[model samples]
Target: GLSDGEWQQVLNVWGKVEADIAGHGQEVLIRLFTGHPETLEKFDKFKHLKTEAEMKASEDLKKHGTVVLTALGGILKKKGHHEAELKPLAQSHATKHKIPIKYLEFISDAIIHVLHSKHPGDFGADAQGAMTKALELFRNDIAAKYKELGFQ
Candidate 1:
């Protein structure tokens, strides 16, 4: 659903951070947990981390962050036309993981925060808006899948 220009802007900014996927991904998770600690309860590996320092030192967190970012990167590479790819993830998170629907927005915000922090100049308003739109489309796709799975 992104215009060609919007997609280009999003991918351009994404390229800047893709090289440090794990580091940036970890930063996104840290930002997410810092802003909404309750979300930590959803991550079995991270739930035990009682402090930011512990999260920073966690290998599991780092690994999971890499996985998360890898999946997201794949979606971006597909230019947001990834409903098939998103379906299983939505089903697992909704039915198995029992993650609230609202957390999708939180994660998106965290991702944007990391992107902006890493490249404030390049990730300006246009890029941010493009990324936000792309993520929103992805979130909507997942939400629809969640509904189809009878979990939301």
Candidate 2:
């Protein structure tokens, strides 16, 4: 449930980062790992990387970063049209990856944090609010599947 104006605002601000989605996505993941080292244990490929510099240099990080950004980029395109684009990926985390549910909120926040940092002027209260709502939709969708699969 985003308003008309809110959707428009989201598109406008979101469009700015469409150019370097990979780089921004990389930063988000890097920041997340740095902030919560324990979370890296979920990624077998990334778990061995100890330092931030080493993590940044790893090819695995780049690939995952791109994947995450691509999914998010899809969502920002029509402002709510392609949340289904993320449906399978979200569910897979619970059913297969078994990623901790707590990381969902942290990941959402990390994306927002990076976007806001990158586009300070364009991403204001209205934009952040809309992004938060949209992200909540994805988060809730993932959580629902997680609960259904008995992974809470």
Candidate 3:
């Protein structure tokens, strides 16, 4: 399996970033690493040898993407446009409306566990898409919670 050249490349890349990550089995992402625009940016393309730091950096971005979603959710709640704004805030903020707005913070994180972000872009379409889905779900939970609190 070792082409000597390929093997050396692995050593060369790993040498710079091998202390952190630990790949075990066939990750749904193993092939992804060999492909994809975002991931492709990490490798040498011709040299080939992605170290652990690169993988960890990617994982960190996923977490940041989640954080961005959480932040946008907070912003919507503050602006009192939870419903319209979240539906696209950027793509459709003008036509959406429903969330009571006051409970934005408590309700946002209440349902979306951004802390558990995995493979940021691969998780959905992008930070925005994943946040959209999460925001919608978050709104539904808020509605139900409000009902329990007598908003009904």
Best by TM-score: 1
The collision pairs in model 1 are: none
Q: Which should have the higher lDDT, number 1 or number 2?
A: 1
State the lDDT at 23 in candidate 3: 26
Q: Could you give the C-alpha RMSD of every candidate to the true structure, in order shown?
A: 1.1, 1.9, 19.3
Off by over 4 Å in 2: 81-83
Q: Please rank every candidate by TM-score, starting with the best.
A: 1, 2, 3
Tens-place lDDT digits, model 3, residues 26-123: 12133333333344343343123365445444654434334444444354333333554444432221123332433343333322332223223432
Would you estimate the TM-scores of all the predictions? 0.95, 0.88, 0.22
lDDT of 1 by residue, 67-106 (tens): 8988887888788778677877888899899987789899
**Model 1, TM vs. native:** 0.95
**Candidate 3 clashes between residue pairs 3 or more apart in a chain or in different chains:** 84-96, 84-97, 85-89
